[PDB]
Design an enzyme around this catalytic site. Sequence first.
Site, short mmCIF file in Angstrom:
data_model
loop_
_atom_site.label_atom_id
_atom_site.label_comp_id
_atom_site.label_asym_id
_atom_site.label_seq_id
_atom_site.Cartn_x
_atom_site.Cartn_y
_atom_site.Cartn_z
CG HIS A 9 -0.52 0.43 2.57
ND1 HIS A 9 -0.33 -0.40 3.58
CD2 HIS A 9 -0.35 1.91 2.81
CE1 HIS A 9 0.12 0.36 4.57
NE2 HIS A 9 0.06 1.79 4.09
CG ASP A 48 -0.40 -3.70 2.93
OD1 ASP A 48 0.06 -3.26 1.72
OD2 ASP A 48 -0.94 -2.82 3.65
N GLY A 91 2.15 6.71 8.84
CA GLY A 91 3.53 6.83 8.89
C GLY A 91 4.18 5.77 9.04
CB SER A 97 2.08 1.86 6.74
OG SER A 97 0.74 2.07 7.22
#
Lengths: 13, 245
Positions: free
Chosen positions: B46, B97, B196, B198
């Site tokens: 992502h 992801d 942030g 992630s």
Amino acid sequence: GXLGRGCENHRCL
Amino acid sequence: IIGGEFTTIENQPWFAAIYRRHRGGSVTYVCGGSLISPCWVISATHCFIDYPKKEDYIVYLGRSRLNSNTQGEMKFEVENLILHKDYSADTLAHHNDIALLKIRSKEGRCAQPSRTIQTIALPSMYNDPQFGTSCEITGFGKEQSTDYLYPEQLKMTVVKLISHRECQQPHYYGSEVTTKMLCAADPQWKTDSCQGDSGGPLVCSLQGRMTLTGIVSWGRGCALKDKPGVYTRVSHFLPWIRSHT
């Protein structure tokens, strides 16, 4: 709308 | 991140800081990642799906601060950007992801291990810590809702793993969370990853070995009651990781 974790570096952010 | 502690890269030496260069030449922080071998950083798809041009990305290792230099830091370009082909996003949930970045210095070199740069072990097939286990997350993400800039200093916190049964309760995430995901949160909802963070690591001690159990993926709000952080379950993706590296 498209906010938070999962949405970094997105046009929709 | 919310809550937790400021940290330094020596305490999190597998942590990769990923930035993007914009048209005009400004550079902004994108996401975190984890060094799993000298040439490979693992992160979340992502983080790149809207701007999948690998030339625009900069990866730092050995870096403790967002916008200043850390002694011993190494700068890398992305040689290969591998996103998961079955990645998709729903209103909250992100599926498959996971992303791989093959890194290379301008000299063509991979990471050189040091006090501030080390790899993190991957888990074994379908082997995760028991729910209730305390695990660490690290990143440069928001510290509070009202932040408009990411913090200058790297942060970490400790959260507990939450069972799939708990996470799929109707007031949690219902069936939006799947068994290829791991939930984790603070029992008092005082600390969490946030925007942030992630792509960054969820690290648990498995068999005395520090192991990359999860990748920060999604969640509703940050440190919101009954809304855990949701992490990609790295142990499910080992065949994908092995086949692409």
